[PDB]
């Protein structure tokens, strides 16, 4: 029987094959496989025996050349810097992952006891017989607990795991070959972007240092020297991807800056001592409207009930508690203050002590108040919040439809490029969990409402019916030019401004508009159809090439539902499937901004819009234009 299984595949007789197959039916690791597959395995499966305990089957870092099943005895799963991570017993299988993913061995396999018997299937035989069929979940275990879970979604991709193991996995699988520069960066991108959710810098940076100084516990001098050197090369590569993702946002993180500065010292010292990192060292040397930073300071007015204000000077990323403290300093008080946002319409929201960087989350005409709780209900809006009482048609009517749309898209692109990718992550998962600003995203999202209410404001302040018809015509044209420039955001903003209750009410204005523009607008309204998950918009945006501004409210929706629709943790492990989905949505934004975009008075107007955002006021103005 053992002799039969020791014979080379091409030396096995028909009767040998029949006897082997009968034995394969008792092996539980194969029981989920078909008759067809098990007959093919009968002329491929190799019997392997080793007598000594402590005998090495294979080492961490080596090529995955075999898949194993244990017939008798037990083995230790051994990892550098961790020792025996777990033990596999009779009936268990190992070695699939490296084989299928064409990745290095993530662990060493060492015999636990004397006299162990194995069934082996080598690579080319595994790939033609078992690759698609043997689709068991790969579960890597430490301390009798799952630590990494991988599945066929063709390679096994990470579904869940601990932050440490996920990091270990993505480090080890880095391919340093120059022809794979793009492929390596793409694989790393998910972790590099999403780590702030499950493994903040306070944890990651110490883990990176430890990994950089990790030494192998097996092999000849040269073998150990080579592994450690390539390990270092991999860590540097990850650090480079990590530093590139943050860009200028590193300055906001003292821990990350300290890590990088010390990491550069480490790498440069090692480079000159070992004659290595000749390509990577200079790359690392480089790193060691403008975007608003969290550490930037603002002069912000915080209002009292009697409409007097205190001017505070605090960082953009300051918490509400820090704001309360700053207000209390200048007013010389120690009597329970709360911070409340107030709309132009008198709508009030109490801000929680926990909230950070609230200055940019106000509505267009919103203001910040500080008062004892007893005053909350008695607060009333400021005159400055209620918006203009006279239009500006006499200014922008003299301006070209093309010129206005172009200056809007230019300004919109400056605001859109000010938004860092990580702000989308911070906004979705909650700013307080990161203590980071989303000021650039906040101001860009507010821009959509600014444009919308600009349309409604000018229409509602236009007393003369004839000129009001000229306004509807002009806004429709500005929208058309915006759509041509691929600024879909400002396009939908104008269209929705025309759709506003106060504007759609004006039958006498719409009626007198030429049917050419009636049909143009009706076509724009159909692009807004929420039917089949906004299919009309989604197809429109999909057809377009890179330099484009997407419909931002729908992007915020996608992100919201990705976060709420999916658990961050599954069985106390990071749900990396969720992490990928969020990252994909953020990469969609990156794709939109992958290509650049190709009259001072028009510029000045577009960038200094004064707007009414009080809907009651706008409806009242509408009702007296056309009763």
């Amino acid at each position: 029987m053992r002799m039969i299984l020791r014979k080379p595949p091409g030396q096995r007789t028909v009767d040998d094959l029949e006897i082997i197959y009968d034995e394969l039916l008792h092996i539980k690791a194969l029981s989920h496989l078909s008759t067809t597959v098990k007959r093919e395995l009968a002329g491929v499966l190799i019997f392997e025996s080793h007598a000594k305990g402590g005998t090495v089957l294979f080492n961490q870092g080596e090529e995955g050349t075999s898949w194993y099943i244990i017939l008798k005895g037990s083995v230790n799963v051994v990892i550098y810097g961790k020792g025996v991570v777990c033990t596999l017993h009779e009936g268990d299988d190992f070695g699939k992952l490296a084989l299928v993913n064409d990745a290095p061995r993530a662990a060493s396999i060492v015999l636990r006891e004397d006299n162990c018997h194995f069934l082996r299937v080598d690579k080319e035989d595994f790939n033609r017989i078992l690759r698609d069929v043997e689709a068991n979940t790969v579960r890597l275990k430490e301390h009798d607990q799952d630590v990494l879970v991988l599945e066929k979604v063709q390679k096994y991709t990470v579904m869940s795991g601990t932050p440490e193991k996920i990091l270990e996995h993505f480090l080890e699988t880095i391919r340093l070959e120059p022809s794979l520069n793009e492929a390596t960066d793409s694989v790393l991108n998910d972790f590099v972007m999403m780590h702030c959710v499950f493994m903040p810098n306070t944890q990651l940076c110490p883990a990176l240092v430890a990994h950089y100084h990790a030494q192998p516990s097996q092999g000849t001098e040269q073998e150990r020297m080579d592994y450690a050197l390539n390990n270092k090369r991999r860590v540097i590569r990850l650090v480079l991807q990590w530093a590139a993702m943050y860009g200028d946002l590193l300055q906001e993180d003292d821990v990350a800056m300290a890590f990088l500065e010390e990491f550069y010292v480490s790498v440069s010292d090692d480079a000159r001592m070992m004659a290595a990192f000749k390509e990577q060292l200079p790359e690392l040397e480089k790193i060691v409207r403008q975007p608003i930073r969290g550490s930037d300071e603002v002069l912000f007015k915080v209002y009292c009930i009697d409409h007097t204000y205190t001017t505070i000077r605090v960082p953009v990323a300051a918490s509400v508690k820090e704001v309360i403290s700053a207000v209390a300093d200048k007013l010389g008080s120690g009597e329970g203050l709360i911070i409340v946002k107030m709309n132009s319409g008198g709508e009030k929201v109490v801000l929680k002590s926990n909230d950070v960087s609230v200055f940019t989350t106000l509505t267009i005409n919103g203001r910040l108040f500080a008062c004892p709780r007893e005053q909350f209900d008695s607060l009333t809006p400021l005159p400055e919040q209620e918006g203009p009482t006279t239009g500006t048609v006499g200014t922008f009517e003299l301006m070209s439809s093309k010129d206005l749309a172009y200056q809007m898209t230019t300004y919109d692109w400056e605001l859109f490029n000010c938004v860092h990718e990580l702000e989308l992550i911070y906004h979705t998962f909650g700013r307080h969990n990161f203590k980071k600003t989303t000021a650039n995203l906040d101001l860009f999202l507010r821009r959509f409402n600014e444009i919308q209410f600009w349309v409604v404001t000018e229409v509602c302040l236009c007393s003369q019916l004839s000129k009001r018809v000229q306004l509807l015509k002009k806004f429709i044209k500005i929208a058309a030019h915006c759509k041509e420039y691929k600024n879909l955001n400002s396009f939908f903003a104008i269209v929705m401004g025309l759709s506003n209750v106060a504007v759609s009410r004006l039958a006498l204005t719409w009626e007198k508009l030429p049917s050419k523009f009636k049909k143009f607008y009706a076509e724009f309204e159909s692009l807004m159809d929420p039917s089949r998950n906004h299919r009309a918009y989604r197809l429109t945006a999909a057809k377009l090439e890179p330099p484009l501004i997407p419909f931002m409210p729908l992007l915020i929706k996608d992100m919201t539902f990705t976060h709420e629709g999916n658990k961050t943790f599954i069985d106390n492990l990071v749900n990396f499937e969720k992490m990928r989905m969020i990252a994909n949505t953020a990469r969609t934004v990156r794709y939109y901004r992958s290509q650049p975009f190709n009259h001072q008075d028009v510029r000045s107007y577009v960038r200094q819009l004064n707007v009414i955002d009080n809907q009651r006021t706008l409806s009242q103005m509408s009702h007296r234009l056309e009763p």
Partner: protein, 150 residues
């Protein structure tokens, strides 16, 4: 073909109710970027138009109100302010589509937790009333059943 709308303030549970109806949290991953993300056949087809995550953009809820046929005014029974925000949304519906009567249902979400409840059952009854819970799966399907009947 039917179109139902979920309305309310943030942190109420609008999105949690939407996902839990169309597919369910945890049992399957939720992809909100595909065609059938908010569509569920129950016999008739229902598209849920949810304002969750877009409350800051009033144009989004208006567009949804325009295309809407059934409406769910949801509040948290652990939040005093959220119950008070429902009056305005009710009025806004009878303005965008310009109608007299509209099929709608009031919903009191998060009914599972009682040691944090600050809003009683009584208040919502005076103004269809349901005390549902998205996470505890209580009355999740029932909310969207009433709207098709109306």
């Amino acid at each position: 073909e039917y179109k139902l709308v979920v309305l309310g303030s943030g942190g109420v549970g609008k999105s949690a109710l939407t996902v839990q109806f169309v597919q369910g949290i945890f049992v399957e991953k939720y992809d909100p970027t595909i065609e059938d993300s908010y569509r569920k056949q129950v016999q008739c087809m229902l598209e849920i138009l949810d304002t969750a995550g877009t409350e800051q953009f009033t144009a989004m809820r208006d567009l949804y109100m325009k295309n809407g046929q059934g409406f769910a005014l949801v509040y948290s029974i652990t939040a005093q302010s959220t119950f008070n925000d429902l009056q305005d949304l009710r009025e806004q519906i009878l303005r965008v589509k310009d109608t007299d009567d509209v099929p709608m249902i009031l919903v009191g979400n998060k009914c599972d937790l009682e040691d944090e409840r600050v809003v009683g059952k009584e208040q919502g009854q005076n103004l269809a009333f349901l005390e549902s819970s998205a996470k505890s799966k209580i009355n999740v399907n029932e909310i969207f059943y009433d709207l098709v009947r109306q």
